[PDB]
RNA sequence: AGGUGUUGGUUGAUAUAGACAGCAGGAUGGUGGCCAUGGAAGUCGGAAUCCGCUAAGGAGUGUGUAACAACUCACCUGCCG
C-alpha cells in the first residue's frame, strides 16, 4: 500500500527527534532492542534479577528513579507473549525538561523492517544508534548460490538475512566406462547441466522482478568448482540483471552454511555501489558544462529564477548547505516575503529594515533548506538526488559549484 | 564544402579532367560521346554545359561525370559534394 | 449528398436575380478566410455573396433566356473565381465602401505587383543578422548602428515582375507590405446592360 | 560552409528518396512498392532517415 | 511603450509553478509580484481560467479583464469554497435557466462578430455543451424551440 | 504470410448539372471548448464532440515544440475535357 507505509515512514521520523534530546538526569534510562527471532521469555528472566542487584545502588534518588522505571517495563513486555515481525524497541525512564519538569515516559512499538541488533544502556538521555543508521540504509541486494548439490536465493539489507527460495537436484557422475556410448554419454552428461542452470536463470525471473525493473540496487552470484560463470555468462540469462551482477565468488560450503560466508566475502564491494551511483550524476553535470547546449544552472539567486519557471529535472544538492530559510515580517505596514540568507548575514546584520515607508522588518523563525527542498520536490519537479562530496569528482563539486545545480529540459534563454 | 573542383577540358570536348575533388590525388577522366560538344559556361563558374542532337546521347554523357563523384566510406547525407545536374531544355528558344 | 444541394441554388438564383435586377461581377486572386468574415460584417443589409462554379452559372441562364433576354450578355462574362455581389438602392455607395476598407498585409512570395514599389530608409529593431544574401540583389546598403539603414534606393518588383524566391525570402528579414489585399472589380452589369 | 540554394541540388539525389523494408532498396520518394524481384514487389516503404 | 500580453493565471487562488518569468523576467517585474497582482483584481472568479490583459508601460501595468466562453458557465452554478483533491469528472449537470443565456447574448453584442440574436443564442448555448448542461430539451431540442416562438429580441 | 506480372469473376460508389490526373487560390471565430497536468492553443491522454458565415474551411489528416509559433491535408474553386 502506498497510502499505508507513507504515514508511517515521514511521521515516526519526527517522534524519534524529540525523544532523542530528551536530556533528564542520572542514570535512569533503560534503551532497549531485541531482535524478532529471540523469545520474550529470556527477557523477563534477566529483568527479574535486575531488580534486587539494583537495590544495591548508594544514592537514594538515581536507585529509585531506576526501579520505579524498571518495574513499568516489567509490565509492559507482558502484554507481549511473543516478539513479532520486525522486532521491540522499548523507551522507558524519565525525563526533565523546560520549566523545570518532570514527565514520566515508556515507550514501546514494532518498527518498519526486520531489524537484527541487541542493546542494554541507561545513560541521562535516550540513545539512537540502529535506528538512524538501518532504517535509514535502505538499497538492498540480491545472492544466488550455485552448486551441484542446491541452490538458494536470499537477501541482505544492512544488518538482515532472509532466505527466499532453494531446491535441490541429484547431479549425474562425470566418469565414463565404455567406448562409442562413452562419446554421446557426454552430451548426455553436460545435457543433463544445462536445463539446471536454466532452471536458476528462469528462476531468477520468481523471486527477483517487480514493475518492468527488478526491486534491487545490486548483485552477488556465489559458488566453487566454477558454476557461477555458467551462470553469469550465457544467453539465457537476461540483459539487466546480467548487467548488474557485482561479483563471483569462490568459497568453501554451500546452502545454509555458505550463505553467511558470501556476506563477508563482499566487505569491499557492498560499500561500494553509492560510490558509483552519485558519481556518475556528478559526472554528468560536467559533461553540460563541457557541450554547447547549455542546460546547467548554479546559486542560489539562478536556481531561483530558473526553478519557479519550468522546473529542473534533477535538482543537483550539495546536503550540508549552511543557509538556511529565514522569513521576514514588517511592522507597520504588515507587508512579507521569503528569503535566504549567506554565512555573514544571518549572525549580525541590522540592514533588515523596512526603507520603504522607516520602520524595523523582524524575522519569524526559521526553516533548514536541505529540509524546505523535501517540503516542495515533487511539486517543483521530481525525485529528490541529493549527493555527497567524498569521491574524485563529487570533491571540486561543493568548493566549484557551492552546492547546488539542476539540470534544465528546454532551452533556458538566462541573461548575464 | 573545401576541396573546390577543378575541371578542365581537351579535344575540343571529347574528354574531361576532374581534379582535387574532395582534395584527392588522383586525376579522372570522362569521355564524353561523338557528336555532343562540352563546355564551361560565360554567365556561371563552375557551370559545365553538354550539348548535341540527341537526347540518349547527351544525357547519357551528363551521367558519367555525374558518377564519376561518388562518396565511399563516408556518411552521405553530409558531405554533398560533386558534379550533379541542373537545367535540360533546347539549345535555342523559340 | 450533392443531388439535394443542387435543388436549393437553382431556385435561390431565380429568387435572386428578380429581387435584384442590378448587379457586379468581381473575382478573388489572394482574398483570405477572415478577411472574407471581416467585410461579411460591412455591406451586410444591402449586399449578399453568391458566388459558384462555372457550368452551374451557364444553365441557370437557359432557363432565364425565354423569360428576360437581358440576362444574355452574361454568357461570354465569367472568367477567373467569378462571383456576384448583388445592388439596388446604391451602386456608387456599395464599391466605394470596399475601396476604403482594404485589408492589408505582407505580400505573397509569388503574385506580380501593380505599382512600382519606390524604396526609403528604415530600420528593424534586432541585433546581428548578416548582408551577405541580400547584396546579390543589388542595394548596396550600411550596416549602421544595429539597424541597417538603407543607402541606396534600387527597385526591386516593378510593373509586371514575377515575385520569385531569392527577393522573396530576404523581405522576411525586414517585415513590410506594399499593398492591402482585396478583390479588384473587372466588369458592372446594370440593368440589363454593361457600364462603367 | 556551403551555399543554401546549392544543397536542394545535392541532397536531391542521396537524401530525399524511400527505402525498402524487406531488402533495403532505394527510390525515389514519390513510390508505392519496391522495384526488385528478390523482396517480391512488396509494399513495406519508410522513408530516408533525416541528418540532425 | 504599450505592448498587452495574455496571461491565463490562476485567477483567485494562487498555483504552484509559475512560468510567467519568461514574458515578465527580460523586462522588470518580479516574478513573485504577478502572481498576488491577479489575487485581488479577477475576485470571486475563485479558480476559473481568464487571459489577463496587462497595459505594460514605462511605470506599471493596468489590470483589467477579458471577455470570455466557459467563465460565465461555471460560475452561475453555485458553488461553496472547494478542496484540490478533486474527484473523477468535477464537470457539473445542474439547470441553467432561460434568464441568463439571453442576457448572456447582450454580453455576446460587444466582441461583434455575427448576424441577429437567432444566432448568438446558438453559440452561447453551443459553449454551454462543453461543460454539460440542459435547458429543458437538450441543444437537438433549441433548434427546434427557436423556431416560431423562441425568445428572440 | 505477400505482389500495382498479367488474367477471369463479385459488390458499391463517382460523370457533359462538367469528375480522375496534374498545375494554381482559400483551409476561419465564441475558442486558448471544458476534466485531469508544471502546459494540453486541434494535434501524449479521458470520455463528451456545438452554431453566426457561406462557393468552401472538420470541435482536426500529419510534421513540429516545455506552451505555441510556424508548414500541410479533409472540403470547395480557375484551367482541362
Known amino acids: 500500500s502506498a497510502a499505508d507505509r507513507n504515514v508511517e515512514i515521514w511521521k515516526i521520523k519526527k517522534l524519534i527527534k524529540s525523544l532523542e534530546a530528551a536530556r533528564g538526569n542520572g542514570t535512569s534510562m533503560i534503551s532497549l532492542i531485541i531482535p524478532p527471532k529471540d523469545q520474550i521469555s529470556r527477557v523477563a528472566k534477566m529483568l527479574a534479577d535486575e531488580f534486587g542487584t539494583a537495590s544495591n545502588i548508594k544514592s537514594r534518588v538515581n536507585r529509585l528513579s531506576v526501579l520505579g522505571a524498571i518495574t513499568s517495563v516489567q509490565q509492559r513486555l507482558k502484554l507481549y507473549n511473543k516478539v513479532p515481525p520486525n522486532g521491540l524497541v522499548v523507551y522507558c525512564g524519565t525525563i526533565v525538561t523546560e520549566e523545570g519538569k518532570e514527565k514520566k515516559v515508556n515507550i514501546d512499538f514494532e518498527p518498519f523492517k526486520p531489524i ?23 538499497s538492498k541486494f540480491g545472492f544466488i548460490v550455485i552448486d551441484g548439490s542446491g541452490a538458494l536465493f536470499g537477501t541482505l539489507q544492512g544488518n538482515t538475512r532472509e532466505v527466499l527460495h532453494k531446491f535441490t537436484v541429484d547431479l549425474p557422475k562425470k566418469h ?11 552430451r548426455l552428461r553436460m545435457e543433463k547441466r544445462h536445463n ?3 532452471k536458476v536463470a528462469e528462476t531468477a525471473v520468481q523471486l527477483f522482478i517487480s514493475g518492468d525493473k527488478v526491486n534491487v540496487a545490486g548483485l552477488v552470484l556465489a559458488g566453487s568448482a566454477d558454476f557461477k560463470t555458467e551462470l553469469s555468462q550465457s544467453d539465457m540469462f537476461d540483459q539487466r540483471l546480467q548487467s548488474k551482477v557485482l561479483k563471483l565468488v569462490d568459497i568453501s560450503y554451500g546452502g545454509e552454511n555458505g550463505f553467511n560466508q558470501a556476506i563477508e566475502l563482499s566487505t569491499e564491494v557492498l560499500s561500494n555501489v553509492k560510490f558509483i551511483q552519485e558519481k556518475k550524476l556528478i559526472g554528468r553535470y560536467f559533461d553540460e558544462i563541457s557541450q554547447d547546449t547549455g542546460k546547467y544552472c548554479f546559486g542560489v539567486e539562478d536556481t531561483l529564477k530558473a526553478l519557479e519557471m519550468g522546473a529542473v529535472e534533477i535538482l543537483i544538492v550539495y546536503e550540508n548547505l549552511d543557509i538556511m530559510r529565514y522569513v521576514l515580517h514588517c511592522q507597520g505596514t504588515e507587508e512579507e516575503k521569503i ?5 555573514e548575514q544571518e549572525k549580525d546584520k541590522s540592514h533588515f529594515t523596512d526603507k520603504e515607508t522607516g520602520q524595523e522588518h523582524e524575522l519569524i523563525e526559521s526553516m533548514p533548506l536541505l529540509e524546505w527542498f523535501a517540503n516542495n520536490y515533487k511539486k517543483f519537479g521530481a525525485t529528490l538526488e541529493i549527493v555527497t562530496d567524498k569521491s574524485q569528482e563529487g570533491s571540486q563539486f561543493v568548493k566549484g559549484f557551492g552546492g547546488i545545480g539542476g539540470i534544465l529540459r528546454y532551452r533556458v534563454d538566462f541573461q548575464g | 564544402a573545401h576541396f573546390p573542383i577543378n575541371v578542365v577540358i581537351q579535344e575540343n570536348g571529347s574528354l574531361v579532367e576532374i581534379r582535387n575533388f574532395l582534395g584527392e590525388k588522383y586525376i579522372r577522366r570522362v569521355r564524353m560521346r561523338p557528336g555532343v560538344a562540352c563546355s564551361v559556361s560565360q554567365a556561371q563558374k563552375d557551370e559545365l554545359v553538354l550539348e548535341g542532337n540527341d537526347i540518349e546521347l547527351v544525357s547519357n554523357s551528363a551521367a558519367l561525370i555525374q558518377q564519376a563523384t561518388t562518396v565511399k566510406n563516408k556518411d552521405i547525407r553530409k558531405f554533398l559534394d560533386g558534379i550533379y545536374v541542373s537545367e535540360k531544355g533546347t539549345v535555342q528558344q523559340a | 449528398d450533392r443531388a439535394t444541394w443542387k435543388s436549393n441554388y437553382f431556385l435561390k438564383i431565380i429568387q435572386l436575380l428578380d429581387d435584384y435586377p442590378k448587379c457586379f461581377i468581381v473575382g478573388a486572386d489572394n482574398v483570405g478566410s477572415k478577411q472574407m468574415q471581416q467585410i461579411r460584417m460591412s455591406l451586410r443589409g444591402k449586399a449578399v455573396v453568391l458566388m459558384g462554379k462555372n457550368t452551374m452559372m451557364r444553365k441557370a441562364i437557359r432557363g432565364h433566356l425565354e423569360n428576360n433576354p437581358a440576362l444574355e450578355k452574361l454568357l461570354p462574362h465569367i472568367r477567373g473565381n467569378v462571383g456576384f455581389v448583388f445592388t439596388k438602392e446604391d451602386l456608387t455607395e456599395i464599391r466605394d465602401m470596399l475601396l476604403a476598407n482594404k485589408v492589408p498585409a505582407a505580400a505573397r512570395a509569388g503574385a506580380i505587383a501593380p505599382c512600382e514599389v519606390t524604396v526609403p530608409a528604415q530600420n528593424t529593431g534586432l541585433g546581428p543578422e548578416k548582408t551577405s544574401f541580400f547584396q546579390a540583389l543589388g542595394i548596396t546598403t550600411k550596416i549602421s548602428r544595429g539597424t541597417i539603414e538603407i543607402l541606396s534606393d534600387v527597385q526591386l518588383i516593378k510593373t509586371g515582375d514575377k515575385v520569385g524566391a531569392s527577393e522573396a525570402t530576404l523581405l522576411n528579414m525586414l517585415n513590410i507590405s506594399p499593398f492591402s ?16 | 560552409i556551403i551555399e543554401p540554394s546549392l544543397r536542394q541540388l545535392a541532397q536531391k539525389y542521396n537524401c530525399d528518396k524511400m527505402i525498402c523494408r524487406k531488402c533495403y532498396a532505394r527510390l525515389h520518394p514519390r513510390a508505392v512498392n519496391c522495384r526488385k524481384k528478390k523482396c517480391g514487389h512488396t509494399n513495406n516503404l519508410r522513408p530516408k532517415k533525416k541528418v540532425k | 511603450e504599450i505592448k498587452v500580453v495574455y496571461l491565463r493565471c490562476t485567477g483567485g487562488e494562487v498555483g504552484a509553478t509559475s512560468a510567467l518569468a519568461p514574458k515578465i523576467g527580460p523586462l522588470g517585474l518580479s516574478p513573485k509580484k504577478v502572481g498576488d497582482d491577479i489575487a485581488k483584481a479577477t475576485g470571486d472568479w475563485k479558480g ?3 487571459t489577463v490583459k496587462l497595459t505594460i508601460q514605462n511605470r506599471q501595468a493596468q489590470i483589467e479583464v477579458v471577455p470570455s466562453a466557459s467563465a460565465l458557465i461555471i460560475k452561475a452554478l453555485k458553488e461553496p469554497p472547494r478542496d484540490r483533491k478533486k474527484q473523477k469528472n468535477i464537470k457539473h449537470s445542474g439547470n441553467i435557466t432561460f434568464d441568463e443565456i439571453v442576457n448572456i447574448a447582450r454580453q455576446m453584442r460587444h466582441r461583434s462578430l455575427a448576424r441577429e440574436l437567432s444566432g448568438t443564442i446558438k453559440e452561447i448555448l453551443g459553449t454551454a455543451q462543453s461543460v454539460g448542461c440542459n435547458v429543458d430539451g437538450r441543444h437537438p431540442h433549441d433548434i427546434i424551440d427557436d423556431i416560431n416562438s423562441g425568445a428572440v429580441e
Not at chain 1, 544502556?121 to 535502505?138: G, Q, V
Open chain 3, 181 to 196: 489585399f482585396g478583390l479588384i472589380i473587372q466588369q458592372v452589369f446594370d440593368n440589363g446592360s454593361i457600364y462603367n
Open chain 1, 176 to 186: 565414463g566406462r565404455a567406448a562409442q556410448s562413452a562419446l554421446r554419454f557426454a
Open chain 1, 116 to 138: 537484527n541488533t541487541s542493546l542494554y544502556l541507561c545513560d541521562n538521555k535516550f540513545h539512537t544508534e540502529a535506528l538512524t543508521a538501518l532504517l535509514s540504509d535502505d
Open chain 1, 196 to 198: 539446471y542452470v536454466r
Open chain 5, 48 to 50: 476559473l481560467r481568464i
Open chain 1, 339 to 343: 528569503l535566504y540568507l549567506t554565512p
